[PDB]
Amino acid sequence: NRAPTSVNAQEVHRWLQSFNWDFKNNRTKYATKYKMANETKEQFKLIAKEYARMEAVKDERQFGSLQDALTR
Amino acid sequence: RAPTSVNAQEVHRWLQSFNWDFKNNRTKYATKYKMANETKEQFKLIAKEYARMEAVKDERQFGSLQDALTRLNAGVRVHPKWNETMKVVSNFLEVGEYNAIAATGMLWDSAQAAEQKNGYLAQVLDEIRHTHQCAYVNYYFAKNGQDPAGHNDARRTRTIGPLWKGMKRVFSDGFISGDAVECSLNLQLVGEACFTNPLIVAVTEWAAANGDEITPTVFLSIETDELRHMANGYQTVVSIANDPASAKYLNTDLNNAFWTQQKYFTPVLGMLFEYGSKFKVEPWVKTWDRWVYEDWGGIWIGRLGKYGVESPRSLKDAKQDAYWAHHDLYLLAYALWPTGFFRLALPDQEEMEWFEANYPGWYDHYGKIYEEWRARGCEDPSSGFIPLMWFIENNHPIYIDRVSQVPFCPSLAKGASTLRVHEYNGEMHTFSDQWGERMWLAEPERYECQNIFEQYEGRELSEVIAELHGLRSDGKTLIAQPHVRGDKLWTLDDIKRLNCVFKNPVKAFN
Amino acid sequence: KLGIHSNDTRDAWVNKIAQLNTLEKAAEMLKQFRMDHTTPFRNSYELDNDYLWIEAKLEEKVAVLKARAFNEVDFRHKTAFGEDAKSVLDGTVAKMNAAKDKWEAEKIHIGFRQAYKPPIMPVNYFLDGERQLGTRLMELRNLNYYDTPLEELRKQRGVRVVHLQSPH
Amino acid sequence: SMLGERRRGLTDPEMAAVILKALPEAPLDGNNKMGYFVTPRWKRLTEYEALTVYAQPNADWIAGGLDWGDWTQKFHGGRPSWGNETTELRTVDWFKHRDPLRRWHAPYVKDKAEEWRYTDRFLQGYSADGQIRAMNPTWRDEFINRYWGAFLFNEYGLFNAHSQGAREALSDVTRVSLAFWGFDKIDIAQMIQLERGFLAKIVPGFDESTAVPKAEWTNGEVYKSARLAVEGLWQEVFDWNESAFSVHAVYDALFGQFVRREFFQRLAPRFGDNLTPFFINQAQTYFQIAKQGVQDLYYNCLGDDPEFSDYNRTVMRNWTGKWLEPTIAALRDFMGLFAKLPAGTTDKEEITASLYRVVDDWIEDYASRIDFKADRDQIVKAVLAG
Amino acid sequence: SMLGERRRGLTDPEMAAVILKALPEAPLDGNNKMGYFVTPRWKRLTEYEALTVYAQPNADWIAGGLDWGDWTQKFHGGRPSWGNETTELRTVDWFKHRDPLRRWHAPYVKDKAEEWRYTDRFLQGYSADGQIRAMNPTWRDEFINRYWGAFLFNEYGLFNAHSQGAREALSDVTRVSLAFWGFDKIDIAQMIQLERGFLAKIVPGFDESTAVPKAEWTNGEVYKSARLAVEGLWQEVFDWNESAFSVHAVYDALFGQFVRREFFQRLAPRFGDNLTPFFINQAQTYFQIAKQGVQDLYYNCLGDDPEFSDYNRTVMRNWTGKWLEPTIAALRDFMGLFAKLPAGTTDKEEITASLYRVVDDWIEDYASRIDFKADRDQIVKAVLAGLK
Ligand SMILES: [Ca+2]
Ligand SMILES: [Fe+2]
């Protein structure tokens, strides 16, 4: 089958939690009284590429309004 | 191993060599001219770079539109008259943009040099951009404006009115039907250089004046592309300057193109500008004179004189028939208001003072007439009156030029009042000037356009409107209106009651 | 039933075309229709408001019939009448080059269209013809385009002047 | 002045006040959907459809048209601005087509622009990363400069084959797709030249002049039949649909796909050439993009037309047979380029297999749609004769 | 309401009139150039510089700072918010650095966005073009899924090595470059996973789970020393410059460049794999982009500092020697992967040559800048010892 397919950010994010591995000195370099559970999850399943795209789209508008209509 | 790349001009350097020779490597279209197959283009572009410079322009345009302009409610805070005017200006331009796509596709086929083809090609794409751009203006005003009707369906509701017919002449058929070079003159040498380019800027001016910041945003962006259309129209004259056939045909095709274009825009643009607005920018007579005489007829054609090009012989005529043309036309457009896809308004006092001030004698003719119509009740649906009736009552028949499609009333006009009627093989033809008449006499098979009186003959007004979807979503209220106010909008029924039935004015010479 | 896009006139022709189930009948009817209703030389203007639409619906029938009747080579090189397309083209182009004036040229060109417009002639040959015939027609027409005064030109065209008006 | 002389109705207190006072209380129609009367191809009308469908002012006598009457000005002779006479294909509605990618101008240039800017970045990274070092000298100066380079004229020719369709297309949607199909082709041709120009900058002695590849195209043996087919699709075809259909659903689906994918894309890597494959990735993306449009127009719309399905399929099968031959000939001649390759580069079994992939895909995505009975073994054997 | 209730000072007649009446006749200063006081790196001040330089509120006691006084709130103990004590490197001005690509946020995301959208288009064209067919099964299920896959953890680790610099960087310009260097690394790691996820969709039986490549990374032999070096650069280095410098001008310039370019980029093609090379093109563009910034900061600004040139070079040479060893060890272990390749895939001469390219480029673009005396033969021979 040669149907047009791709992979989205959440499909890659599914495995992002596994990216970190264990080893002796894998710990914070900063002082802290707390202990952040090392299984905590994030709310938005983003990857660098997708993050950049949703932010660049916002920029287009912002700078568009600024350099064009607002200046006129 | 330093960081290096290749730019568009570096590839373009070898673009001219892309085309190779072979027996049938020739134009598929009829043409009296011979485009030198060594002609060069002004801008060294390639597809990739072209797309990038256009996408950058889009970013801004759509950015301003979807963001700040929407936040400011720019789609609403526009004067009512102008919101209507933009239904016509944008949709009519849209088809000029859309036929310019086919037109340059034809020029691209005509060109034999790879560079000249590439020049036209860039326009084929620009024109597609402009089609979608003009479309977006209507789309935006439909979604965000004070009156979507017309903006949301001009593509089908424009067919009802007579003004649309003339639009297809100068910006549709005149762009793609005939000798590739003749078409090139209609589109680039005259249409764009004489009217479209100066016009696009003018519209942004009138738009801004009436609270419309949407149009300036899109049209000023379209404007940035016209530098390339000019080069192509200029390169067309150069690619044929060396052919002996050019010295025999160029001026005739140019004069015909000039006349074709001005015949429509001289009265239509002026009308849309002065009557479709509240706040004025500058008298059309002044504007017209600068565009056609100073900028175009003088500076633009002067630079092409070295290629055998001369000032259009019909130039003086055009100037003399111009002064009142747009005023003469509005009378007809308003009288036939039910055939439009936009709402028209009668000049308020402030405006009548303006008109008279800039057009001495305006009041005693048009002013007095408009006042009579308003007293008659042309704005009120319960009056049972429509300006067309006033024309019938005072024996002022309205004709359609068989060639330009421009409506004219010789018995009432203050401008040209010439009328030539002919019968040829069972058919009657009405002409409004010696240039269009010659065109038809020499090329009768090129002009067989059925006018609205012919097509609508014997038909009752409301039925034509209903059949062609001239209604708002409520299925009762007319899209077109004789005023731009919020209430007392005419309904299909108000029109049916007038029991107005079309008649072909020419059947009288019988 | 009166209408711009739908009227009795059009329905009438629909039924008429529905009864054409033979390439020869259909092809001949289309040619006849073109002689009767198209071009400034049509035999009458009775179908002025519907002919364009009717003609198309007629072409559709001829096309369908031609496709089922012709083999592959013929569909590509023969007219619906069995004529050899290239021969007709080269022949008509021959006369067009032998044309003595613009009045003979237009007769040739306009007639060519009335007789061989697809689906009669294959489009490839037809548009090839459009290109050559049109070029000659223009060359002849655009030469000293303004020399002949309107008074004379009307006489040459053979129009019946019904009314003239001119303050200037 | 800081404020400027021109006053604007949106910001000028006086003018705006007058404007606001003339405004109605609410919109004069609640239907704010431009193109609302257009039949949606998908669930909801798309921006693509709204902005495109019906832009072409066709009258009802051209299937699907909404206007009425003849054109205002026609060609000397009487040829209509647009008419049914410019193509053998017939349909119930020319505005039925829909680019599956819904590409109107803005989206189209946005994508090519991204590709352009990235290409620039890629080349700048490629040159600085010194990757050119590991590329086989013979493959570079011979197969890329001469043979790959000569192929640019093939793409250029296919590009020009679209000129008449841009002028004759009977609808906006079809006209736009056509314009984009051909524009992508000139793009590719210029990308092939961009690579040659790039190599000229990093390889001291590489002449970017098109003279060599052009001479290979005009007078070579490898691309002889290929050029003959291109000259024909371009200048001997006056039917805009036969042109588009034959170019995309026949010649380029077979010859083009073989050269690009089964030769250069397949072998360049073997010679330490990751450059050419970068540009072929684009060409293949473009190809797969155009294919969707080509399929929708000729198969979904025309080939499956409720009234002219039979007729249209008959005509496209006619065209398939008419062009399949010159295409096979173009492939046959192309087979000669393999003998020019250093011994051991590839064998007859690899080439046959690759030929079968191209042919099966073609039967897959094109031939079968119009019931064109194609024999894969016969086609391949005819080509192998090289 | 068609007009809305909120009135705006720019369009509301009343409010605007009041606004217009309060306006001066002309601007109260003709100098409309924000950042005008910033020393331009090029002919004219760039938007990049204006929007970035001096955003960090440093006082004069941190080289280049324009403010004065201590921080308002410090860490328990007294550690300053930012201070000279977080790095061994010294300079006359921390705001001297300039990303040669002049990347501020907007341009940065715009480019990655283009790359993202095109990647999507590429994969959709790749899958529809059925190119996967001609790819060697062993290379796919073994070298891409396991070994290339495992490499994602290398990039991920280098990514995390930037976390402290994002916090400690002594200037805006350096902080922004650092952030972009690390962000490009996580991007690459995710692209390696994107490919594995893509293959899972077009190859029936390809498990996109990271379990296998992760087990290869955590417990394999091929990447053992590589992982040991990554764990160190990341968690055993508390000096943000040693971290950035060692990661980019040492480890990744040698090990990273060899794996990406001299192994996968070089061999994938031979197995009918044009997929992986597509993503490596990105990684290499990113690498060459970061290199320019890394060079400007460590060589142009620090290594050539008018006052601490000598000092800084001494320190970077110290760091080069400190990390060159673990990097050689990472390469040595990597040599083991060649024995896993089908016989005839490549020979010892090809591998040595490729090693020499990586090493010569390194001496070329890095070692020589700080006068680090590197013996290319010794380095390569030490690595070749890893060849089984
Ligand atoms: Ca060897
Ligand atoms: Fe335009």
Curated annotation (Swiss-Prot), chain B:
Give GO BP annotations, semicolon-separated.
one-carbon metabolic process
The protein's matches in CDD domains, at most eight in alphabetical order, are given as:
AAMH_A (cd01057)
EC number(s) on file: 1.14.13.25
Class of this enzyme: oxidoreductase
Q: Name any one Pfam family assigned in the record.
A: Phenol_Hydrox
> Any keyword Metal-binding?
yes
A single GO molecular function term of this UniProt record = methane monooxygenase [NAD(P)H] activity
The protein's UniProt keywords, in alphabetical order, are:
Iron, Metal-binding, Monooxygenase, NADP, One-carbon metabolism, Oxidoreductase
Stretches that traverse the bilayer: none
Stored InterPro entries: Ferritin-like_SF, Phenol_Hydrox, RNR-like
Q: Which residues bind Fe cation 1?
A: 97, 127, 130
Kindly list the positions annotated as binding Fe cation 2. Answer: 192, 226, 229
Q: How is the cofactor bound?
A: Binds 2 iron ions.
Q: Which reaction does it catalyse?
A: methane + NADH + O2 + H(+) = methanol + NAD(+) + H2O; methane + NADPH + O2 + H(+) = methanol + NADP(+) + H2O
- Co-factor(s): Fe cation
Catalytic center at which residues?
134
Secretion signal, residue range per the UniProt entry: none
Q: Self-association or partners: how does it assemble?
A: M.capsulatus has two forms of methane monooxygenase, a soluble and a membrane-bound type. The soluble type consists of four components (A to D): protein A, comprising three chains, in an alpha-2, beta-2, gamma-2 configuration, is a nonheme iron protein containing an unusual mu-hydroxo bridge structure at its active site and interacts with both oxygen and methane.
Q: Which family does it belong to?
A: Belongs to the TmoA/XamoA family.
Q: What does this protein do?
A: Responsible for the initial oxygenation of methane to methanol in methanotrophs. It also catalyzes the monohydroxylation of a variety of unactivated alkenes, alicyclic, aromatic and heterocyclic compounds.
Q: What is this protein called?
A: Methane monooxygenase component A alpha chain
Q: Which organism does this record belong to?
A: Methylococcus capsulatus (strain ATCC 33009 / NCIMB 11132 / Bath)
Swiss-Prot record, chain C:
* Protein EC: 1.14.13.25
- Give UniProt keywords alphabetically: Monooxygenase, NADP, One-carbon metabolism, Oxidoreductase
Source domain of life: Bacteria
Reaction(s) catalysed by this chain, per the record, are: methane + NADH + O2 + H(+) = methanol + NAD(+) + H2O; methane + NADPH + O2 + H(+) = methanol + NADP(+) + H2O
Q: Which cysteines are joined by disulfide bonds?
A: none
Biological process, per Gene Ontology: methane metabolic process; one-carbon metabolic process
Functional summary from the UniProt entry = Responsible for the initial oxygenation of methane to methanol in methanotrophs. It also catalyzes the monohydroxylation of a variety of unactivated alkenes, alicyclic, aromatic and heterocyclic compounds.
What is the recorded name of this protein? Methane monooxygenase component A gamma chain
The species this protein was found in:
Methylococcus capsulatus (strain ATCC 33009 / NCIMB 11132 / Bath)
Q: Write the gene name.
A: mmoZ
UniProtKB/Swiss-Prot annotation, chain D:
Its EC number(s): 1.14.13.25
- Name any one Pfam family assigned in the record: Phenol_Hydrox
Q: Which SUPFAM superfamilies match?
A: Ferritin-like (SSF47240)
Quote the catalytic activity from the record.
methane + NADH + O2 + H(+) = methanol + NAD(+) + H2O; methane + NADPH + O2 + H(+) = methanol + NADP(+) + H2O
What general EC class does the enzyme of this chain belong to? oxidoreductase
This entry's Gene Ontology molecular function terms read:
methane monooxygenase [NAD(P)H] activity
Any one GO BP annotation for this protein = one-carbon metabolic process
Keywords for the protein's UniProt record, in alphabetical order: Monooxygenase, NADP, One-carbon metabolism, Oxidoreductase
What's the subunit arrangement here? Answer: M.capsulatus has two forms of methane monooxygenase, a soluble and a membrane-bound type. The soluble type consists of four components (A to D): protein A, comprising three chains, in an alpha-2, beta-2, gamma-2 configuration, is a nonheme iron protein containing an unusual mu-hydroxo bridge structure at its active site and interacts with both oxygen and methane.
Q: What does this protein do?
A: Responsible for the initial oxygenation of methane to methanol in methanotrophs. It also catalyzes the monohydroxylation of a variety of unactivated alkenes, alicyclic, aromatic and heterocyclic compounds.
What protein does this entry describe? Methane monooxygenase component A beta chain
Q: What is the lineage of its organism?
A: Bacteria, Pseudomonadati, Pseudomonadota, Gammaproteobacteria, Methylococcales
